[PDB]
Structure 1
């Protein structure tokens, strides 16, 4: 695959292998790892991360909605995939044919699906319980038993799993975590029998309490080498390896005289004789306008973004006359200096999860494995 703009993101797949393998070491052998690659693997490349995670010890994959699961199938992934979110009852036949497990949390969904499906493939369900997140999931005993009965009555419906999700597993203070875990324990007793897969842990819960994970963990953010929250960094068992880096190159260089203005709204004004560089990356690439007072790395040094950010490019003050084509690093390391996703996140005033997800389809992803380039993936490519 190829790309024709000097702006690209690099994804280090060795880092992803390490982050997942260290977890395989940490957890009991009887506990499986479900790698969650929703949102195109948190903006890292769905099938590439999936292939790598399965190599390091993962056995299942999790995705947010049906299309994401189907896309993984079309690219040759044969491992089990669980759709964590909602789906249409009409799509039950397609899920069953493609061996995609579904999350279920209401009986009226099942009422509706028994009526539209009748074999021959089995559909594996994972009952979702709401123990305090308030998102999706059952909350009463009458509804829990209704779902289980409806599943038991259809010969092609199978209850393969049961799970919940924590809202504060990444907080140093475990008070709410405890209420939720205890509630899950109370809620599991409402089932006539334990299905084979009971899971509740996300990255934070499984890295902090490996013995409290039952038989399957849903590993996300930590797989990419990003800490679940600033709170728990020191509580992490093994060092995490950041996998995403973002780069560009100088396409224009020029010296300004005192008084000349730069960019939209002509916000910036040079005061001495300064060198301004232009890079081909803007907000349509996920490098949002709010980052106008941030900086990038040029030739081992910090250089500020100058003026407002444009849709496809932005300007930065240079230390002096640098050659056109000089590599600029937006996220990553250049010498002794480094800009991490948490740094960008802080400036954007968000969590690290939101940063790689926002780097758009427009930006090519170059995959590295064994310290060498594996493949290039340009979404708007030929």
Structure 2
């Protein structure tokens, strides 16, 4: 893949490999690692991360919905994939045909799938139990037993596993977390027999209580080198390696006289003679307008974004006259300076999770592995 705009993200797959391999060491040899690669691998590239994770010790993959699993299959992934979200009963055969496990939490969903699917491929289901997140999952025993029976009844339906998800595993206080964990052990008692795969832990839960993970953990945010929360940062077993960086280059440089305005609404006025540089990145690239008072790195120093951010471009105040083509780092490091995803998240008043997911399809991803450029991924490429 090739691209024609000097703006690109870089994904360090060696970082991703180390983050996963280190967990593989920390976990019991009997414990599976399921790599969560939904939302294009949290904006890092679905197939590239999936392969590296499998390479580092992950044995299974997880996506948000069916479309995300089929895409991985088409790209050549043959590892098992679990759809964590909802799916249509009418798509059961497709999922069964492609060897994709489905999450189930409603007995009426199964009644539908049953009437539509007869075989010959078996469907692996994972029972979701709501223990306090309030998102998806069964809540009562009656509904739970009903589901187990329907699966039991059908020759091609198999209950491969069951799980829950924690709402506060990244909180230093573990009161709610303990309630959910206890609720889980109680509900597992509703099952006639324990499925071969029992899971509940996410990045935070598996890194904090690796002994309470059962047979499989679902590794997400931490695989990308980002802490589930600033609060638990000082409690993580090993150092995480940030894998995502974002860069651009100056395409224009000019000197403004005092009084000259910049950008929409003319909300910025040069106080004195200053050098303004224009970079080819805007909010359609995920660099939201709310980043208007943030700073970028240029020539090793912090340069403030001046004026409002445009759809495809934005201006910054430079230290002096720098040459067009000069590299600008928006996320990453230059010399001694560095800007992490956590820094961007803080200014945007959101969590790190949301930042890389928002860097759009317009921004090509360049992959590094073994300290070398592996491949380029340009969504709007040829």
CA-CA distance at 1:3 after TM superposition: 0.2
Separation of aligned partners in 2, 1:62 and 1:114? 24
Separation of aligned partners in 1, 2:236 and 2:9? 27
CA-CA distance at 1:207 after TM superposition: 0.1
SS of the residue 1:193 aligns to: coil
Separation of aligned partners in 2, 1:180 and 1:273? 60
Cα-to-partner distance string for 1:120-168 (whole Å, 9 max, x where unaligned): 0000000000000000000000000000000000000000000000000
Separation of aligned partners in 1, 2:200 and 2:24? 17
CA-CA distance at 1:4 after TM superposition: 0.2
SS of the residue 2:292 aligns to: helix
Listed as ranges, the matches of 1:43-192 within 5 Å are: 43-192=43-192
RMSD (CA atoms): 0.2
Separation of aligned partners in 1, 2:307 and 2:181? 49
CA-CA distance at 1:260 after TM superposition: 0.3
Cα-to-partner distance string for 1:185-221 (whole Å, 9 max, x where unaligned): 0000000000000000000000000000000000000
CA-CA distance at 1:117 after TM superposition: 0.3
CA-CA distance at 1:271 after TM superposition: 1.0
Cα-to-partner distance string for 1:273-321 (whole Å, 9 max, x where unaligned): 0000000000000000000000000000000000000000000000000
SS of the residue 2:116 aligns to: coil
Normalising by structure 2, we get a TM-score of 1.00
Cα-to-partner distance string for 1:297-347 (whole Å, 9 max, x where unaligned): 000000000000000000000000000000000000000000000000000
CA-CA distance at 1:28 after TM superposition: 0.2
SS of the residue 1:293 aligns to: coil
CA-CA distance at 1:65 after TM superposition: 0.1
CA-CA distance at 1:42 after TM superposition: 0.1
Separation of aligned partners in 2, 1:175 and 1:89? 37
Separation of aligned partners in 1, 2:258 and 2:169? 53
Separation of aligned partners in 1, 2:243 and 2:227? 12
Cα-to-partner distance string for 1:248-271 (whole Å, 9 max, x where unaligned): 000000000010000000000001
Separation of aligned partners in 2, 1:22 and 1:258? 54
Matched with 1:259 is 259
SS of the residue 2:190 aligns to: coil
SS of the residue 1:110 aligns to: helix
Matched with 1:313 is 313
Separation of aligned partners in 2, 1:371 and 1:355? 25
Separation of aligned partners in 1, 2:31 and 2:297? 42
Separation of aligned partners in 2, 1:229 and 1:330? 22
Cα-to-partner distance string for 1:71-94 (whole Å, 9 max, x where unaligned): 000000000000000000000000
Separation of aligned partners in 2, 1:31 and 1:230? 27
SS of the residue 1:329 aligns to: strand
Matched with 1:241 is 241
SS of the residue 2:231 aligns to: coil
Separation of aligned partners in 2, 1:19 and 1:90? 38
CA-CA distance at 1:64 after TM superposition: 0.2
Q: 5+ unaligned residues in a row in structure 2: which ranges?
A: none
Normalising by structure 1, we get a TM-score of 1.00
